[PDB]
Amino acid sequence: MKYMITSKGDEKSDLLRLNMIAGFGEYDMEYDDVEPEIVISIGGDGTFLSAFHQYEERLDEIAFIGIHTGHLGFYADWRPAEADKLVKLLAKGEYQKVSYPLLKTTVKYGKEATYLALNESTVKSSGGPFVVDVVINDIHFERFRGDGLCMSTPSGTTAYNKSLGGALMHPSIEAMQLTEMASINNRVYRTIGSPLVFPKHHVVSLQPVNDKDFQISVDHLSILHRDVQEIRYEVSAKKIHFARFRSFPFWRRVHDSFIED
Amino acid sequence: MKYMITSKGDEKSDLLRLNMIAGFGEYDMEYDDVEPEIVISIGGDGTFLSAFHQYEERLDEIAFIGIHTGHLGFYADWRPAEADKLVKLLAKGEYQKVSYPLLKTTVKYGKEATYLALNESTVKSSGGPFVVDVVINDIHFERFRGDGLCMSTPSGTTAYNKSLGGALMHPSIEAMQLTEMASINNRVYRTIGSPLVFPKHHVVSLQPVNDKDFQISVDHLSILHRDVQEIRYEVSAKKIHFARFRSFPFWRRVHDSFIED
Amino acid sequence: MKYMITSKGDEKSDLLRLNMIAGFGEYDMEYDDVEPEIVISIGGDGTFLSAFHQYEERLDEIAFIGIHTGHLGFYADWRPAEADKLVKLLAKGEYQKVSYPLLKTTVKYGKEATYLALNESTVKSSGGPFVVDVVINDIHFERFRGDGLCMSTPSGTTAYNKSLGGALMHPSIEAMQLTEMASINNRVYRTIGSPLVFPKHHVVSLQPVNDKDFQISVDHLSILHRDVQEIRYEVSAKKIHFARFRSFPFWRRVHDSFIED
Amino acid sequence: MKYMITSKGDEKSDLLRLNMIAGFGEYDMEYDDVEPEIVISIGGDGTFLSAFHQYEERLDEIAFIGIHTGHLGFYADWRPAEADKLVKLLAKGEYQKVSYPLLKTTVKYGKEATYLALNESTVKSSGGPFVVDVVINDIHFERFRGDGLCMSTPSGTTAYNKSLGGALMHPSIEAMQLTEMASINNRVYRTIGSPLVFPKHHVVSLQPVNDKDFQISVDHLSILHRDVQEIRYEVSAKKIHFARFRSFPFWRRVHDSFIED
Ligand SMILES: C#Cc1nc2c(N)ncnc2n1CC
Ligand SMILES: C#Cc1nc2c(N)ncnc2n1CC
Ligand SMILES: C#Cc1nc2c(N)ncnc2n1CC
Ligand SMILES: C#Cc1nc2c(N)ncnc2n1CC
């Protein structure tokens, strides 16, 4: 089909990209970075995240694949030595596809901006104290005071979510997970503390109490938003599709990354 | 229909039970604690757990309801003043039912014992050091050294799971959560640390490394098992059914219990 | 003696300041905000922190006292109704003084800036990834990757240190405590995780690995420092002196603030 | 002087013991396991703990030394290849000694038992729910509900204390640290959560609320105590003395054990 390859930019990943293109030249494949059906990422998980966001409006027409030239990644989970075998099997096609859930972030102002996250979306203040009211399906759940909040996808749970104490969720679970950053808890101010895992169709709404300016991240992207009335989280209707060419279980990927490999 | 009522035993809960029975006597209801279709628990969540385990072989033919005479419970979530209104609506029937997932524990010896948990199942040693190999879907994930492990249901996540750092999961998610108790982590011994959330059909197997005697809890029940070859966790095929007579969202129940009420 | 009074600025604290000044006018007291020997703070702990930093070059010649017009503070630990009794006992003098340790932060460039902290000093990146090498008494201890680090005084342990998982230390202990913010731990990157408590004369040095720009906070003050070669932490030789006019134990102050009052 | 050597019992440690004894036979040394002045432990930290407790009534007349035949220990911190050099320098004497603080546990009944701990002392229930009132210097601080409590020495902070979230304290600090095991925190029951670090002369008292039977551990020893009225913790007046024959900083020992070696 049509395909394209993004590279981290170092000479290891560029030279690997050129060899795969040359290998693809021996099959019924067309290089097209406008409307590809296969997107190959060569580098690390950061390279994969840029590839995902480069094409986030054609997600249902694309199967992603990642090659790690550095350490093993959770998205770039195939080694460079497998590139030739990867070229042949992608060209023959007829592979199976797997889908991971995504997170939808809505930012409203007094003007509504929506973002798609593969890992997580975080909210911090623009300098002063961070205070928001946390609303779950229209019921006021808590007044959070602290550094910030993080809403993670299942496959994002091994990233910033993990460093904040969140649970690791198998990506077949259509859910999102909210974790706290350095919350203040005393006799006056009370947060839940524990991570919270929300199913599909649950809406988590953040509403300002005083300051209306927040630094909002979506994966790598981080923008200062001004005059926001609401931050809105829910599991996206859209999913990311991975080209699957062998068995590499998520829990094995967790073992290889954090226990030993 | 047929119904029965269990009481914590104090005079507040016994006298409330007698008044509901007398109130039920004005309707087409039959008291039967052998084959009831409605099980009413009056006391706390512990009273509810005993009622659940008393009838865990007729789970698909029973709708449970709980009344808290002490503080608000996550299962006994209706107040005693609502008993009269509860009697009338149960008698008329035509209520909606909600279902929560359950945890299945299998203990094998050298002789296989299965248990159903509404909250969680924990494993500790019988005295000496607790060491098990943790196997996820037949792949060896980690060698756990510490005090013990805890596998929780979604509705159990607000109980022992919460005290161990686990996430709170909405009970509509068919999953189970594994949390660590005081794990040893150094250069030699490595555990994942983070809680792990497993979907249906994932099997988590604990296998002894040296000692074969473990103290295993299932909700309130705690038995010392000897000569065990494997402890096996998975989401049960069976579910507990609750009689639903108004809207009391899980996240509101979490708010009322941990934030303020 | 000479004395001065700072107020949070609201009319509750200003009117309380004027009444204490008028009450002081009936004794051998002189209002002097240039070289006072008694510094009275009326407001909250933030008002007290500004008073401490306003006079941090005359620390050995000043006894501080704090009045909380809002909720109970750890430094402003006397209620407004005690102001009249406070005026009379300060004027008579002959009170006992208590001393708390302080934290010394040294920032070197390629140009060396020293700061005194009553609560804590934190280090974060100026945007990108935060990576520093952590050196303890000239031995390289770890390479920290994460959001940032926090070094707390004993009396600061109930503030940001507590929200990060740090221990609460009784202020009679001459020490400082280092806590991590959202550290990354996998097979490649390893931090200690646990808070670290250092005695006097131990020097904790942070050294950049790549980026040389850091956002450094000292209590409330937060400055972006550029071209820094080293951040240096140690227990200060200087201490803050409190005028003590009755028994209010630190652990009781902890109980009143976090358990119930 | 007089000396003795304890061995873990495996043939590696026994054969090393015999060679050191033979090496000691070439100097003015006497083997005496009744009144030694040097106690050599060959094995692991567990072997060292037994040696410490074997002679805990002659602590001020003994300098301890530990040899690790397995992995590096925090007390057995010298390798077997250094045994010959260790023999020669102990025989010549004139070494420097270092001292670590110890923890004193007092158990009173309705009959008072005192124990000395090098690592920590823990308290759990004998089966049912664990509830104690926590009293600090005669002020009631909290009502703890959970699995148990752990009071650690400074050098014990790298052991069970670390697994419970406690801070690592440099052993030159005369203090003790209290950490919680799986505490219950909701609207009704409140604990401090954070570890607590207490200086010398602070007394931490545990008092039963209902059940009077507790499983109390002191390092390796674990005894079920019945009819206890109070558990009493404070920094001991006694200290353990180590023979110091080169520089091996505590923080380097922490680095080698948890970061990499
Ligand atoms: C970029 C990126 C990224 N995504 C991750 C993930 N989903 N799990 C673990 N590590 C991850 N990284 C690297 C920091
Ligand atoms: C028995 C019981 C019980 N079940 C609970 C639950 N699911 N969530 C929160 N608290 C709970 N309890 C009381 C200790
Ligand atoms: C400003 C300030 C301040 N200092 C504190 C402290 N030492 N302990 C607890 N809370 C504290 N605050 C309020 C956020
Ligand atoms: C026995 C023993 C022992 N004491 C220790 C200590 N003080 N720090 C770290 N590990 C330790 N161990 C081994 C479990």
CSV table of C-alpha atoms in Angstrom, one decimal, chain D residues 157-246:
chain,number,residue,atom,x,y,z
D,157,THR,CA,15.9,2.7,57.8
D,158,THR,CA,17.3,0.8,54.8
D,159,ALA,CA,15.5,-2.4,55.9
D,160,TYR,CA,11.8,-2.9,56.6
D,161,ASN,CA,11.4,0.9,57.1
D,162,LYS,CA,12.4,1.5,53.4
D,163,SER,CA,9.8,-1.0,52.1
D,164,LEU,CA,7.1,0.9,54.0
D,165,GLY,CA,7.9,4.3,52.5
D,166,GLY,CA,10.2,5.6,55.3
D,167,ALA,CA,13.1,7.9,54.8
D,168,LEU,CA,16.7,6.8,54.8
D,169,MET,CA,18.5,8.5,57.8
D,170,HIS,CA,22.3,8.8,58.1
D,171,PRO,CA,23.2,6.8,61.3
D,172,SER,CA,24.9,9.7,62.9
D,173,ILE,CA,21.5,11.1,63.7
D,174,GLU,CA,20.3,10.0,67.1
D,175,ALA,CA,16.7,9.4,66.2
D,176,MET,CA,14.0,6.8,65.5
D,177,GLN,CA,11.4,6.7,62.7
D,178,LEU,CA,7.8,5.5,62.9
D,179,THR,CA,6.2,4.2,59.7
D,180,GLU,CA,2.6,2.9,59.0
D,181,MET,CA,1.6,-0.4,57.5
D,182,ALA,CA,-1.6,-0.2,55.3
D,183,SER,CA,-3.4,2.4,57.4
D,184,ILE,CA,-7.2,2.9,57.0
D,185,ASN,CA,-8.1,6.6,56.2
D,186,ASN,CA,-11.6,7.8,55.6
D,187,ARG,CA,-14.0,10.4,56.9
D,188,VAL,CA,-14.1,8.6,60.3
D,189,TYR,CA,-10.6,7.3,60.8
D,190,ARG,CA,-7.6,9.5,60.3
D,191,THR,CA,-3.8,8.8,60.6
D,192,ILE,CA,-0.9,11.1,59.8
D,193,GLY,CA,0.2,8.9,56.9
D,194,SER,CA,3.7,10.4,56.7
D,195,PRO,CA,6.6,8.7,58.5
D,196,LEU,CA,7.5,10.4,61.8
D,197,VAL,CA,11.1,11.0,62.9
D,198,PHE,CA,11.6,11.4,66.7
D,199,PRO,CA,14.8,12.7,68.5
D,200,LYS,CA,16.3,11.2,71.6
D,201,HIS,CA,14.2,11.5,74.8
D,202,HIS,CA,10.9,11.5,72.9
D,203,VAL,CA,8.8,8.6,74.0
D,204,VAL,CA,6.2,7.0,71.6
D,205,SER,CA,3.6,5.0,73.5
D,206,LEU,CA,1.1,2.5,71.9
D,207,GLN,CA,-2.0,1.8,73.9
D,208,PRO,CA,-4.7,-0.8,73.1
D,209,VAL,CA,-8.2,0.3,72.4
D,210,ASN,CA,-9.9,-3.1,72.5
D,211,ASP,CA,-7.8,-6.2,71.8
D,212,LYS,CA,-4.8,-6.7,74.2
D,213,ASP,CA,-2.8,-9.3,72.2
D,214,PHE,CA,-0.2,-8.2,69.7
D,215,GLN,CA,2.5,-9.9,67.6
D,216,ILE,CA,5.7,-7.8,68.4
D,217,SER,CA,8.9,-8.2,66.4
D,218,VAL,CA,12.4,-7.0,67.4
D,219,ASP,CA,14.7,-7.5,64.5
D,220,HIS,CA,14.4,-11.2,63.7
D,221,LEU,CA,12.7,-12.2,67.0
D,222,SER,CA,8.9,-12.2,66.9
D,223,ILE,CA,6.8,-13.0,70.0
D,224,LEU,CA,3.1,-13.0,70.6
D,225,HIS,CA,2.5,-10.9,73.8
D,226,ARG,CA,-0.7,-11.3,75.7
D,227,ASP,CA,-2.4,-8.8,78.2
D,228,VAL,CA,-0.2,-5.9,77.2
D,229,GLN,CA,-1.1,-2.5,78.6
D,230,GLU,CA,1.5,-0.4,76.7
D,231,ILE,CA,4.2,-0.6,74.1
D,232,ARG,CA,6.9,2.1,74.6
D,233,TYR,CA,9.5,3.3,72.1
D,234,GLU,CA,12.5,5.6,72.6
D,235,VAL,CA,16.1,5.9,71.4
D,236,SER,CA,18.2,3.7,73.6
D,237,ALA,CA,21.0,5.0,75.8
D,238,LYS,CA,23.1,2.1,74.5
D,239,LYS,CA,24.9,2.1,71.2
D,240,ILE,CA,26.6,-0.6,69.0
D,241,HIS,CA,30.3,-0.1,68.3
D,242,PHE,CA,31.8,-1.0,64.9
D,243,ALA,CA,35.5,-1.6,64.4
D,244,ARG,CA,36.4,0.8,61.5
D,245,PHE,CA,39.4,-0.2,59.4
D,246,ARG,CA,38.8,2.0,56.3
